[PDB]
């Protein structure tokens, strides 16, 4: 149920195998979002500034890499509880300036799980992953 | 009970997942959690290892202990495709444990479980049965001539 | 259900064990390599020396004994080449035990030595091998022999 | 002159050429066989490990314990504090035997030799040769 | 090598002396079925052909070459093999159309599906022939004339039947 | 194709990543990646294999059986559709007429047509189904050490009618 | 025929090595011989009632056949030393002597090995060479010329 | 008459059947039967080879003769894939036969038959024509400068 | 200490590494090229075979006659009686030329060298090194 | 005794073993590494090119300029007239530096060494060794 | 402007057609025609190169000039698959041109054209665009300061 400092590095290893090199990454991004929007149709309104109407437009592709790019930093360091809280706290002020219900990034949680499972080599522990990214979710929300 | 063969290939992959790096950040944190799990069931052993300043969990020294345990343990595994060089290096590693006091034959059979209770939480695909079988024939050959 | 002597091991054995007989003739090899195994036994346990009177062990190079040295390795050989397809091997060795049964004065503790000779004797005569593998299989052959004693 | 970047490179190249398993033993024994052909006296201290014939086992065992040591050393070579600790414990093992201070300086010459053939033209000699000194001096 | 997969749904790998035996040694007993025992290929008088390229000897330039089966016997007690005799014949190119004629004997193996022959003895220009019928039908082939010792590939000709 | 990419081209090859087959909308400019979203294996379907060769020896069975408790589709994102499967094995020896039916859960992937079974016991033997893509009465699926990715034992399954 | 022809003695010694091979084909190479023999002499199976010789694919019998080849390997192995052969061979006499074997049978078991060897072997061998050597062994076990 | 090429590959297999072993039991018995077949047609030659105690068929010495004949003869064959090293080693092996008395040019052309006489009886598949052609050009280059 | 078993092994390993045909000549010439780089004076006695340049033919011929000798030796190495006979005849060939007794002891050092690379870590040094002595002493 | 037929052969064999591209640099650096292990003093004059560590670049650059020279030499080795011209210009570059006349005679010994392994048993030593002298003397 | 990569493989083949030989007959005649084409547009440069006896078209010396130009030029190309060894050897080749009088930064940019006007007649398939682009970044760096 907690980050379980051993289990913390479990996902740290798995994530490396899933989030890969090459242009598949750009494809690995598309999956997550195409999954998310199908759960919450009206969440696209929040992206009017990034051309989030259609998801295949080049301006949007850029947006999604930064998202993974950002999330890579998070999972990269669960070893140092200091630097995480520093780096993570940065993301708070990013989202804080607009209205994100606690319903959405519960669904974006469900989205990453499924996509990872497919992309990954048939073996991973859900309840291990479930905890760690949820710790990050408690982070950006700003309060637990 | 018969290390067999396929069990060894089973190991060589399992061990390659935990050991893969040129940095020591990971190899440390894993093995430290082995003993940290050991001492919870045999607090008497903790009275030993006083030479290394055990009392400090994060010492500038204590790491320099566990690090040599790994590189010693990893030294075993990379011999399994070539035996007869194991015995020699096995017998050596045995004698380094009889020259001190407070090493009980009961302690080894304990840590056999210590990996099994907490070795996987690091990996995903893992064979408990294999790792448990070929590990005794390593340890049951250390405690032979020791009390 | 036996874990011991798993399938993958004896494949290694048969491959290594076959490196000796890559050479043609080979009669002289296993005569000589067999002549050592029996003599080197007598100099540990002297008691067994009496048992070989019928074959005239007193002559090491003697023809009458030499022909006996073949049939021990050759009898061992068919055992190794038959390791796969187990249910036959049980019957194969069963017939050897009974063959040692009618002979009197054969003590179970002898084989325990004969293994230790061979287990440490073998590593001299081969290029490479995994001692762990051979250890498993020869416990299979030897232990099942003498089960009649 | 060893620091930060020029150290980091030695780690990556240590991973590759050092190999694994049966390929590791073959690496170690290929090292010593260099120096013993060059400096015949060096086999005097090894009478404990039967260094009569290096190809024999039990020395094979030894030479692997050797290289394993460099792993511990080179692996922690980033964090300066904890480095000295192993270097401290290491020297202790070499106090009680007859050595010359020149054999050490000889060792690194013939070690960086063998890495040549496997890495061909690709590596920083400067990085190695100086940063193996920071390992070797701690033994004196 | 030294074994031949079975013919059926589920591929097994069975030793070559156990086909057309009169005992089922497979899972399904593929070895008893006339999709295998059929002798249509070594019935006496059949003849294969197709012009040969020579790589190793004689350098004659491509000219026709036939194999023919003069007499076949199958022993009642060891039905695994069909013993047979043949005559290889290929066109030397001199002036008039002429042919040297080796004479052969050998066995036909139901496993490999490959008949293989050899020169008899005291026969001019001693060659041997290896025909593999691994294609679908019992006609066509991929043969090769070989030297009888090394099984070294003297001349390769992809042969049919008329 | 390249690595994890999938080849949709009928007459004019178009190379697309694996995660977009049965994605829910048109990515392949042919339109040939959306035709296939019908799942082939329906609950109650029962497959029986015969052995090809076996070195991973638990019981080294003559032949083994496989049944579907229930297929299920995660609604929103469906390239992958998870499964419950029994695996029945009816052994025999000197002594015993032992039995087995271990339950497990795999997933069938519309991408490369493979189905997987995650190890039923702790022994770490994954069963890797592979259809050809046009047939669905038989698959050549074979067992694998989940950690090592090595082919150990094959079976040729058939659907029963 | 030839009297073992001490040169020709080693001819078969070489060929035999190429035929009698390594691996599990040997177990198969055994089956051939017997399946061949019994088809020549149907009533010879009576002699094997002790070894479960009713059906020939039963495991208990497979063991029996290897010893037979295993035994015969020893024979052909040594035709060099006329002493050790006569010693080793003479052993086989007392093996068979305790039961009734007509001179008809192991004439047929002679015919059996020939055919099987030819198939198993690489298209080239001299019959009249083989014919002599194993027949010398047959004169051996029979106990008298 | 033209050793050619294919004939040499023909040899290299034929020779590999007779020579295959690390023991000398076989290589001896074959070559001994060569001369044993030679002396039957030229008993005069038997008056030579007195240095080696020829009169004892099984001597502790005489073997040590024939053994060097083989290893010398086998030394020829393993050069046929590389010529120009043959001539040198051919010319050498020639001169070692002119330093003695009683070696007639007629004797070599005799043993040419001696193998053809009885070398087949050891092998099964054998090419008489090939072995006979490439063997002369070996021997007819030994008797060149010799009476 | 050379015996029935520890001798047998040398035969099997002699078969493998020694190779065949064009591979054999390449083996021999790779041997001498070792020792002549080490001990330059050794080329004095070879003026008969034009040992000026080893890569030239006629020496190539020689060095093969050499190794062929070891075959005769090592091949009969089981039967002790007949062994001495060849060793007897062999020494006779070396009586009439200028040698030092130290070159022999040098030879076996550099021969067992070259077999190292082809056999890697697999063989008994003890078996070779002692059982080549039983060949070398018969030449004195 | 050279310059004709026996010269021509050196050209053909120069083409093969010398290789190309990344394979060329690997050839040069494999040469010097021979001689510096043999004659340690030789690295004194290279302080200009940082011959401290040969594996470092800028020496890699140098040693290729070296071999490139032999190309110019050996390439024109047929036409005798124009040969001396390059040999004339070449020596001029070596006048202003501290050398010994024995290092040259050393060089050709260790160059024809390395070509041995790549060409095995096939070449005329006599052709090379004498016809590299016609290159080396022009430098004195 | 960006040598890129593919352009270099384009070169490596082009250069392999002109350079292929162990004789110097061809490599000379090509490069001589480069300067012979150069001097027609900058006769002032011809006043330099007096040290090498330029005045003789056919000299026993002048060839020994152009030959070293090629082997120097060819030395560049065979480094393009391995950079960082170029700069070092580039900077060197630069300084050998500043130690003399009469280097026109202007003349380097001249010979850039000189090949482009005398290449397409020796070869058949030729890429003008490629050879012209990757050649400047060579010459533009050997005329880095001035001269
Ligand atoms: C683990 C979950 C998430 C992480 C790590 C994450 C991270 C980030 C990062 C790194 C940026 C980059 C901003 C920049 O470069 O300037 C960003 C932007 C953004 N994120 Fe997220 N995010 C997450 C979840 C969400 C969710 C669930 C939503 C909405 C439902 C959301 C909405 C946005 C928006 C609208 C922006 C762009 C704001 C702008 O362009 O002004 N994010 N996010
Ligand atoms: C399970 C596998 C184990 C291995 C492979 C192993 C190996 C080693 C090695 C190589 C050293 C360093 C020796 C040296 O530097 O020469 C060491 C130190 C030590 N080990 Fe272990 N060890 C193991 C388990 C244990 C256990 C279970 C105990 C006690 C319960 C123990 C007690 C010690 C102690 C006390 C030292 C310190 C030696 C000193 O005081 O200097 N070890 N071990
Ligand atoms: C390890 C595998 C062994 C095998 C395969 C084996 C095989 C044989 C066989 C087959 C025979 C009978 C020969 C026949 O029936 O004609 C035999 C005889 C005999 N073996 Fe063994 N043997 C083995 C080990 C031993 C050992 C360890 C001993 C004694 C310590 C032993 C003592 C004997 C004796 C005394 C005979 C009596 C032979 C006679 O009466 O002439 N064997 N062995
Ligand atoms: C260059 C880094 C070196 C390291 C890291 C190193 C490390 C070690 C280690 C770990 C041991 C064994 C401790 C044990 O088994 O518990 C040891 C023993 C030994 N080392 Fe080294 N060593 C090095 C260099 C050398 C060199 C150059 C020599 C030269 C002769 C040498 C000679 C020995 C000897 C003779 C022993 C045996 C001590 C004994 O068995 O009593 N070492 N070394
Ligand atoms: C070259 C020909 C033959 C050889 C070398 C041979 C050899 C042997 C050998 C070595 C055994 C093993 C005895 C043991 O381990 O207890 C044996 C058993 C036997 N042989 Fe043969 N044999 C030959 C021909 C025959 C023939 C033709 C028959 C019958 C038609 C026959 C009948 C038997 C029987 C019945 C046994 C088993 C007796 C028992 O179980 O007590 N053999 N033979
Ligand atoms: C056919 C191929 C032959 C070959 C390759 C051959 C080769 C050799 C060789 C290598 C030796 C030993 C020389 C030495 O130790 O230095 C030898 C010895 C001898 N050969 Fe031959 N030889 C052949 C045939 C013959 C024939 C046909 C005769 C006589 C009819 C003959 C007469 C001798 C004699 C007398 C010696 C003994 C030299 C001595 O007394 O020490 N050889 N031969
Ligand atoms: C190690 C085992 C050795 C063996 C088995 C051996 C054997 C032989 C043989 C067979 C010959 C030629 C006889 C002939 O052509 O008829 C020979 C010649 C020669 N051996 Fe050795 N030799 C050995 C060691 C040595 C060594 C260490 C040297 C050192 C220089 C040496 C120097 C020579 C020389 C110079 C000749 C030439 C005789 C000549 O051309 O006239 N040998 N040896
Ligand atoms: C064998 C034929 C040799 C040739 C063809 C040759 C050619 C050359 C060339 C072309 C240069 C550079 C000229 C330039 O960069 O413009 C040079 C420089 C040099 N050579 Fe050689 N060389 C040879 C032998 C030697 C030897 C044996 C040495 C021994 C140490 C040597 C030492 C040097 C040194 C130190 C330089 C550097 C000069 C400097 O940095 O100013 N050379 N050589
Ligand atoms: C385009 C590429 C060029 C390259 C790669 C090149 C390279 C070289 C080289 C390597 C040398 C011999 C240097 C030595 O022996 O140390 C040389 C000589 C020379 N180069 Fe160039 N060169 C080029 C173009 C030019 C041009 C365009 C000029 C003048 C317009 C020029 C003027 C000279 C002169 C005068 C010499 C003779 C040096 C002397 O007087 O001793 N080069 N060049």
Concatenated DSSP letters of chain B: ----SHHHHHHHHHHHHHH--SSSHHHHHHHHHHHHHHTTT-TTGGGS-TTTTTT-TT-TTHHHHHHHHHHHHHHHHTTTTS-SHHHHHHHHHHHHHHSSS---HHHHHHHHHHHHHSSGGG-SS--HHHHHHHHHHHHTTTSSS--
**Rounded Cα distance, H26 and I46, in Å:** 35
Which residue among B1, B5, B82 sits closest to C9, beta carbon to beta carbon?
A: B5
Report the first-to-last Cα separation within chain I, whole angstroms: 19
- d(CA E19, CA E3) in angstroms, rounded, equals 11
- Compute the distance between CA of residue F135 and CA of residue K107 in angstroms, rounded to an integer: 73
- On whether any CB of chain H is under 8 Å from the CB of C61, the answer is no
Give me the phi and psi of G4, to 5 degrees please: 85, -25
Burial class from Cβ neighbours inside 10 Å (0-12, 13-18, 19+) for residue H27 reads buried
| Segment (H or E) for E2 | none
Count of alpha carbons within 13 angstroms of residue H61, beta-carbon side: 10
**J133-to-C3, J114, J137, J139 alpha-carbon distances in Å:** 72, 17, 6, 10
Residue D14 Cβ contacting ligand 4 at under 6 Å? no
Q: Are E30 and E7 in contact (CB under 8 A)?
A: yes
Q: How many other C-beta atoms lie within 10 A of the C-beta of residue A23?
A: 11
DSSP state of E83: E
Residue E7, C-beta contacts closer than 8 angstroms, at least 6 positions apart: E30, E33, E35, E36
Residues in chain I within 8 Å Cβ distance of J113: 37
Q: Are F137 and F146 in contact (CB under 8 A)?
A: no
- Burial profile J91-121: b = 16 or more Cβ within 10 angstroms, e = fewer: eeeeeeeeeeeeebeebeebbbebbbeeeeb
I59 near C CB under 8 A:
no
By C-alpha distance, which of J15, J113, J125, J121 is closest to I38? J113
- For B72, B91, C55, D46, G41, the CA distances from B96, given in Å and listed in that order, are 12, 9, 51, 19, 71
Q: Which chains touch F (3 or more CB pairs under 8 A)?
A: A, B, C, E
Contact across the interface for H121 and G8, Cβ inside 8 Å: yes
If we measure between CA atoms, which residue out of A99, A12, A17, A29 comes closest to residue A66? Answer: A29
Q: How would you class A22 by CB atoms within 10 Å of its CB: exposed for 0-12, middle for 13-18, buried for 19 or more?
A: exposed
Q: What is the DSSP string of D25-62?
A: HHHHHHHHHHHHHH-GGGGSGGGGTTTTSTTSTTHHHH
Q: How far apart are the C-alpha atoms of H92 and H70, rounded to whole Å? A: 16
Vertex D115, ends D109 and D117: CA angle to 5°? Answer: 115
Question: Looking at chain I from residue 16 to 35, which residues have their Cβ under 8 Å from any Cβ of chain H?
Answer: 20-22, 24-25
Report the b/e string of A36-65 with b at 16+ CB within 10 A: bbbbbeebeeeeeeeebeebeeeebeebbe
What is the rounded CA–CA span in Å between residue H39 and residue H36? 6
Cβ partners under 8 Å of residue K133, min gap 6: K1, K2, K3, K4, K7
CA distances from B123 to A7, A18, A124, A129 (A): 9, 15, 9, 13
Which segments of J5-139 does DSSP mark as H helices, in order? Answer: 5-18, 22-38, 59-75, 80-95, 101-119, 125-136
Q: Exposed/middle/buried for F2, CB within 10 Å: 0-12, 13-18, 19+?
A: exposed
Breaks (C-N over 2.5 A) in chain B follow: none
Q: What is the DSSP string of chain C?
A: ---SS-HHHHHHHHHHHTSGGGSS--HHHHHHHHHHHHHHHHTT-SGGGGGGGGGTTT-SS-HHHHHHHHHHHHHHHHHHHT-SSHHHHHHHHHHHHHHHHSSSS--THHHHHHHHHHHHHHHHH-S---HHHHHHHHHHHHHHTTTT-
What is the CATH code for I1-140? 1.10.490.10
What 3-state class would DSSP assign to F88? strand
- Cα J24 from Cα D8, distance rounded (Å): 29
- What are the residues of chain G with a beta carbon less than 8 Å away from any beta carbon of chain C? 13-14, 17, 22-24, 26-27, 59-60, 62-63, 66-67, 70, 73-74, 77-78, 80-81, 83-84, 87-88, 91
Position in ligand 3 atom list of the atom nearest CA C72: 7
Exp. method = cryo-EM
Distance CA H127, CA H7 (A): 9
Please write down the long-range contacts of J85-93, taking CB distance under 8 Å and 24 or more positions apart. J85/K60, J85/K61, J85/K63, J85/K64, J86/K64, J86/K67, J86/K68, J87/J135, J87/J138, J87/J139, J88/J138, J89/K64, J89/K68, J90/J138, J90/J139, J91/J138, J91/J139, J91/J140
- J79 membership: H or E segment, kind and range: none
Resolution (A): 3.8
Beta strand spans in chain G (E): none
> Minimal CA–CA distance to G74: which of C32, C26, C141, C94?
C26
Chain D CB contacts of B88 below 8 Å: 57-58, 60-61
Which class for E89: exposed (0-12), middle (13-18), buried (19 or more C-beta within 10 A)? middle
D20 and B78 within 8 Å at the Cβ level: the answer is yes
Nearest chain I residue to C19 by CA distance is: I12
Residue H102, number of CB atoms within 10 A of its CB? 11
Rg (CA), chain I: 15
- Scored b (16 or more CB within 10 A) or e, C53-74 reads eebebeeeebbbbbbbbbeebb
Interatomic CA distance for residues C130 and C121, integer angstroms: 14
* Residue closest to B84 by CA, chosen among J81, C122, J135: C122
Q: Could you tell me where the beta strands, DSSP code E, fall in chain A?
A: none
Q: So where are chain B's domains?
A: 1-147
J113 to each of D113, I49, J107, how far by Cα in Å? 18, 21, 10
Q: Which residues of B61-88 are buried (b: 16+ CB within 10 A; e: fewer)?
A: bbbbbbbbebbebbbbbbbbbbbbbbeb
Q: Which residue of J has its CA nearest to D123?
A: J55
> How far is residue A12's CA from residue A79's CA, in Å, rounded to a whole number?
10
Burial of H147 (0-12, 13-18, 19+ CB in 10 A): exposed
Query: What are the C-alpha distances in Å from B48 to residues B70, B73, B104?
Result: 19, 20, 11
Which neighbouring-strand residues pair with E5?
Answer: E13
- CA dist list (Å): K105 to K44, K140, K145: 14, 9, 9
CA distance I106 to C19: 32
- CA–CA distance, F75 with D87 (Å, rounded to integer): 60
| DSSP H or E stretch at residue E119 | strand E114-119
Instruction: Enumerate chain G positions whose Cβ falls within 8 A of a Cβ in H.
Output: 5-8, 10-11, 14-15, 80, 123-126, 129
Strand partners, F116: F107, F128
Alpha-carbon distance of K131 to B47, in angstroms, equals 77
CB A68 within 8 A of CB A20: no
CATH of H1-147, one of 1.10.490.10, 3.40.50.150, 2.40.40.20, 3.30.465.10: 1.10.490.10
Cβ atoms of residues I135 and I74 within 8 Å: yes
Give the separation between CA J31 and CA J109, rounded to whole angstroms.
11
Domains and CATH numbers, chain E: 1-162 (2.40.128.620)
If we measure between CA atoms, which residue out of I66, I102, I86 comes closest to residue I135? Answer: I86
Burial class (CB in 10 A: 0-12, 13-18, 19+), E82: buried
User: Is the CB of F121 inside 8 Å of chain B's CB atoms?
Assistant: no
Closest by CA to I89, choosing from H26, H89, H60, H97, is H60
Atom 17 of ligand 4: nearest residue by CA position: D66
Q: Tally Cβ neighbours within 10 Å of residue F47.
A: 21
Q: Which of K77, K76, K75, K68 lies closest to K28 in space, CA to CA?
A: K68
Q: Give the residue from D132, D138, D137, D136 showing the smallest Cα distance to D7.
A: D132
| Pick from D55, B105, H88: nearest CA to I127 | D55
Radius of gyration of chain A (CA): 15
Measured in degrees and rounded to the nearest 5, phi and psi for residue D43 equal: -80, 0
Q: Which of I17, D27, I9 is nearest to C127 (CA)?
A: I9
May I ask the CATH class of domain F1-161?
A: mainly beta
CA dist., res. F138 & res. F132, Å (int): 9
Q: At what angle do helices G82-97 and C63-81 cross, to 10 degrees?
A: 70
Q: What angle do helix axes I59-76 and I80-95 make, rounded to 10 degrees?
A: 150
Identify whether the C-beta of residue G129 lies closer than 8 Å to the C-beta of residue G11: yes
A137 — alpha (psi -120 to 50), left (phi > 0) or beta? alpha
CA–chain centroid gap for C39, Å, is: 14
Largest separation between any pair of C-alpha atoms in chain F: 62
Asked if C90 reaches chain B (Cβ–Cβ under 8 Å), the answer is no
* Residue G61 near residue G51 (C-beta atoms within 8 A): yes
Q: How far is CA B113 from CA B7, B136, I16, in A?
A: 18, 10, 47
Instruction: Tell me F108's DSSP state.
Output: E
Query: Measured between beta carbons, which residues in chain C are less than 8 angstroms from residue H23?
Result: 23, 25, 28-29
Q: Which residues of chain F from 48 to 77 reach within 8 Å of chain A, CB to CB?
A: 74, 76-77
| H19 pocket-lining for ligand 6 (C-beta < 6 Å) | no
Q: What is the distance of C-alpha B76 from the center of its chain?
A: 10
- Bridge partners (DSSP) of residue H90 are none
3-state SS of H36-73?
HHHCCCCCCHHHCCCCCCCCCCCCCCHHHHHHHHHHHH
Spatial contact of K105 and K143, defined as CB atoms under 8 Å apart: yes
Does J134 count as an annotated binding residue?
no
Using an 8 Å Cβ cutoff, are E157 and E143 in contact? yes
- The answer to whether E124 faces chain H, any CB pair under 8 Å, is no
**Which of H65, H72, H77 best tests ligand 6's pocket when mutated (most atoms within 8 Å of CB)?**
H72
Tell if the CB–CB gap between D60 and B85 is shorter than 8 Å: yes
Ligand nearest to the CA of A136: 1
Pairs across E and H, CB distance < 8 A: 16
Nearest-angstrom CA–CA distance, C71 and C31: 9
| Short-list C70, F58, C19, CA closest to G72 | C70
Domains of chain A: 1-144 (1.10.490.10)
Domain boundaries, chain D: 1-140
3-state secondary structure (DSSP) of residue I48: helix
All domains of chain C, ordered by start, with CATH? 1-149 (1.10.490.10)
* Alpha carbons K46 and H138: distance in angstroms, whole number: 69
Secondary-structure breakdown of chain A: helix, strand, coil percentages, each rounded to the nearest 5: 75, 0, 25
8 A C-beta contact, residue F18 and residue F1: no
Distance (Å, rounded) from C-alpha J53 to C-alpha C87?
A: 67
In this structure, are residues E161 and E46 in contact, taking their beta carbons and an 8 Å threshold?
A: yes
Helix (H, G, I), strand (E, B) or coil at F103: strand
CA distances A100 to A63, A104, C35, C79, Å, are: 17, 7, 88, 75
**How far apart, in whole angstroms, are the C-alpha atoms of residue E80 and residue E76?**
10
Chain Cα centroid distance, residue F123: 19
Neighbours of D31 (CB within 10 A): 18
Taking alpha carbons only, the member of A6, A13, A3, A140 closest to residue A85 is A140
β-strands E145-146, E81-86 pairing: unpaired
Answer yes or no: are the C-beta atoms of J18 and J11 closer than 8 Å.
no
Closest CA relative to residue F111, chosen from F44, F30, F49, F19: F19
| K51 pocket-lining for ligand 9 (C-beta < 6 Å) | yes
- For C84, name the nearest residue in chain F, comparing CA atoms only: F55
Backbone angles phi, psi at F153, to 5 degrees: -140, 135
Question: Radius of gyration over alpha carbons of chain C, in Å?
Answer: 16
In chain C, the residue whose alpha carbon lies closest to the alpha carbon of G64 is: C92
Q: Is the CB of B138 under 6 A from ligand 2?
A: no
């Amino acid at each position: 149920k907690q980050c379980g400092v051993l289990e913390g590095l479990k996902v740290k290893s798995e994530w490396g195998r899933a989030y890969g090199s090459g242009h598949d990454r750009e494809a690995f991004s598309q999956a997550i979002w195409r999954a998310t929007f199908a759960q919450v149709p009206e969440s696209r309104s929040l992206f009017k500034r990034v051309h989030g109407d259609d998801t295949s437009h080049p301006a949007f592709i850029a947006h999604a890499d930064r998202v993974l790019g950002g999330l890579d930093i998070a999972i990269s360091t669960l070893d140092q509880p200091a630097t995480l809280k520093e780096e993570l706290d940065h993301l708070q002020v990013q989202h804080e300036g607009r209205k994100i219900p606690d319903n959405y990034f519960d669904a974006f949680k469900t989205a990453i799980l499924h996509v990872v499972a497919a992309q990954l080599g048939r073996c991973y522990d859900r309840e291990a992953w479930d905890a760690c990214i949820d710790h990050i979710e408690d982070g950006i929300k700003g309060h637990h | 009970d018969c290390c067999s063969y396929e069990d060894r290939r089973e190991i060589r992959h399992i061990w390659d997942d935990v050991w893969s790096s040129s940095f020591t950040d990971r190899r440390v944190a894993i093995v430290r959690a082995v003993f940290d799990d050991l001492f919870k069931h045999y607090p008497t052993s903790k009275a030993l290892f006083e030479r290394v300043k055990i009392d400090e969990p994060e010492s500038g020294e204590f790491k320099s202990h566990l690090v040599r345990v790994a590189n010693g343990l990893k030294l075993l595994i990379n011999l399994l495709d070539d035996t007869l060089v194991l015995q020699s290096h096995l017998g050596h590693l045995a004698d380094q444990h009889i020259q001190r006091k407070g090493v009980t034959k009961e302690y080894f059979r304990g840590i056999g479980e210590a990996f099994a209770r907490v070795l996987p939480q690091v990996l995903s695909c893992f064979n408990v049965d294999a790792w448990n079988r070929c590990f005794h024939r390593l340890v049951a050959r250390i405690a032979k001539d020791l009390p | 259900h036996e874990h011991c002597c798993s399938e993958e091991d004896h494949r290694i054995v048969q491959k290594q064990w076959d490196i000796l007989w890559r050479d043609t003739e080979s009669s002289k090899i296993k005569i000589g390599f067999g002549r050592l195994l029996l003599t080197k036994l007598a100099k540990d346990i002297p008691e067994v020396n009496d048992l070989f009177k019928r074959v005239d062990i007193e002559h090491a190079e003697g023809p009458k004994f030499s022909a006996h040295a073949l049939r021990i390795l050759n009898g061992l050989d068919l055992a190794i080449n038959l390791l796969d397809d187990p249910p036959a091997l049980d019957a194969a060795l069963d017939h050897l035990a009974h063959q040692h049964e009618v002979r009197e004065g054969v003590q179970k503790a002898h084989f325990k030595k004969f293994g230790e000779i061979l287990a440490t004797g073998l590593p001299q005569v081969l290029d490479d091998y995994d001692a762990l593998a051979w250890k498993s299989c020869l416990k299979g052959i030897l232990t099942k022999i003498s089960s009649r004693l | 002159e060893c620091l930060v970047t020029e150290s980091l490179k030695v780690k990556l190249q240590w991973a590759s050429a050092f190999g694994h398993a049966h390929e590791r033993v073959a690496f170690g024994l290929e090292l010593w066989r260099d120096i013993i052909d060059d400096h015949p006296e060096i086999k005097a201290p090894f009478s404990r490990v039967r260094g009569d014939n290096i190809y024999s086992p039990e020395f094979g065992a030894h030479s692997q314990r050797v290289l394993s040591g460099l792993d511990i050393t080179i692996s922690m070579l980033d964090t300066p504090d904890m480095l000295a600790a192993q270097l401290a414990h290491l020297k202790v093992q070499h106090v009680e035997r007859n050595l010359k201070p020149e054999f050490f300086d000889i060792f690194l010459k013939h070690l960086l030799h063998v890495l040549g053939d496997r890495l061909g033209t690709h590596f920083d000699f400067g990085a190695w040769h100086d940063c193996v000194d920071q390992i070797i001096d701690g033994i004196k | 090598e030294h074994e031949s997969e079975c013919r059926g749904d589920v591929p097994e790998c069975i030793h070559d002396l156990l086909f057309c035996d009169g005992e089922k040694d497979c899972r399904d007993g593929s070895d008893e079925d006339p999709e295998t025992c059929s002798l249509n290929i070594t019935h006496v008088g059949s003849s294969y052909t197709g012009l040969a390229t020579w790589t190793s000897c004689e350098d004659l330039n491509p000219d026709h070459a036939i194999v023919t089966i003069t007499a076949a016997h199958r022993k009642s007690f060891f039905p695994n093999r069909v013993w047979l005799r043949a005559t290889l014949s290929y066109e030397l190119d001199e002036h008039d159309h002429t042919v040297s004629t080796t004479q052969l004997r050998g066995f036909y193996n139901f496993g490999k599906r490959e008949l293989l022959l050899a020169p008899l003895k005291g026969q001019s220009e001693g060659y041997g022939v290896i025909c593999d019928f691994n294609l679908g039908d019992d006609d066509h082939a991929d043969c090769k004339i070989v030297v009888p010792s090394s099984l070294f590939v003297c001349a390769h000709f992809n042969a049919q039947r008329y | 194709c390249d690595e994890h990419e999938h080849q949709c081209g009928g007459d004019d090859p178009q190379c697309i990543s694996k995660l977009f087959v049965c994605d829910g909308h048109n990515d392949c400019r042919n339109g040939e990646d959306e035709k296939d979203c019908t799942l082939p294996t329906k609950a109650g379907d029962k497959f029986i294999g015969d052995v090809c060769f076996d070195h991973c020896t638990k019981r080294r069975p003559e032949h083994m059986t496989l049944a579907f408790e229930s297929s299920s589709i995660a609604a929103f994102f469906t390239p992958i559709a998870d499964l419950h499967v029994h695996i029945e094995i009816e052994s025999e020896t000197d002594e015993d007429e032992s039995e087995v039916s271990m339950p497990a859960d795999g997933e069938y992937s519309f991408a490369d047509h493979r189905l997987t079974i995650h190890p039923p016991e702790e022994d770490g033997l994954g069963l890797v189904g592979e259809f050809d893509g046009y047939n669905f009465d038989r698959f050549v699926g074979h067992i694998v050490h989940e950690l090592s990715e090595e082919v150990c034992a094959e079976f040729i399954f058939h659907r029963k009618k």
